[PDB]
């Protein structure tokens, strides 16, 4: 019940949109040796995505205000903005280093099913990519290599275990394509990958289940929206 009591507290925190309390509740369930069910895995992802997501939005807005105030030449303000940006960067480091740690120490080993293994390796790439966003110089290149080996590992498993229609595989392909575009500045690969993952799905659209239908078609539509945007001015 200790774990079931925590899952419920996280679900209440989800609907209340108190995601700081959601990560804690679902962090304890992850600390427990037992592998997380698909529901629990989702609740964790939701919780840690929203908590970092908020900071990432904040980082991008102040980073764009900095860019503006660079041209203005307001040196007094630029110091205030830089200091505020740094304050957020440290937060993005701590929250990234949390989920990555509890991934490597508890979840990745515990994860025995093929579906879980990909999801946790995908998750690792995502949070090393988010590090790589605001990261600079050697720190960035190290965060990129960490993300690549994670995404590459996830991809190697996803090819054989899961079918192309599965939402977890399409989500990886989509996140791996965004990685090649934003982080590695390899756009011709990003598109090649995103399209490959799309074609392989529509080929086996019959295989897709009415249960996992909505989850996959949404990710399939995003892949296409990106492909269009990357190949048109």
């Amino acid at each position: 019940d200790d774990r079931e009591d925590l899952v419920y507290q996280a679900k209440l925190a989800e609907q209340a949109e108190r995601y700081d309390e959601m990560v804690e509740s679902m962090k304890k369930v992850a600390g427990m040796d037992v592998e997380l069910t698909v529901e629990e895995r989702n609740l964790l992802s939701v919780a840690y995505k929203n908590v970092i997501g908020a900071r990432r939005a904040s980082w991008r807005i102040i980073s764009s205000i900095e860019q503006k105030e660079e041209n203005k030449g307001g040196e007094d303000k630029l110091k205030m903005i830089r200091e505020y940006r740094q304050m957020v960067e440290t937060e993005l480091k701590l929250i990234c280093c949390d989920i990555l740690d509890v991934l490597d120490k508890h979840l990745i080993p515990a994860a025995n099913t093929g579906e879980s293994k990909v999801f946790y390796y995908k998750m690792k790439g995502d949070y090393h990519r988010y590090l790589a966003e605001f990261a600079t110089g050697n720190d960035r290149k190290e965060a990129a290599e960490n993300s690549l080996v994670a995404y590459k590992a996830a991809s190697d498993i996803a090819m054989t275990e899961l079918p192309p229609t599965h939402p977890i595989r399409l989500g990886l392909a989509l996140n791996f394509s965004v990685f090649y575009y934003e982080i590695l500045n390899s756009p011709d690969r990003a598109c090649r990958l995103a399209k490959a993952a799309f074609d392989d799905a529509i080929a086996e659209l019959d295989t897709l289940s009415e249960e996992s239908y909505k989850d996959s078609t949404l990710i399939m539509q995003l892949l296409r929206d990106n492909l269009t945007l990357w190949t048109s001015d």
């Binding site: 992802s45 939701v46 995505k49 995908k122 995502d126 989509l174 965004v178 995003l222």
Partner: peptide, 10 residues
């Protein structure tokens, strides 16, 4: 320039 990535499952 920011682009859509894999959203949390419904």
């Amino acid at each position: 320039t920011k682009y859509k990535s894999a959203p949390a499952a419904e």
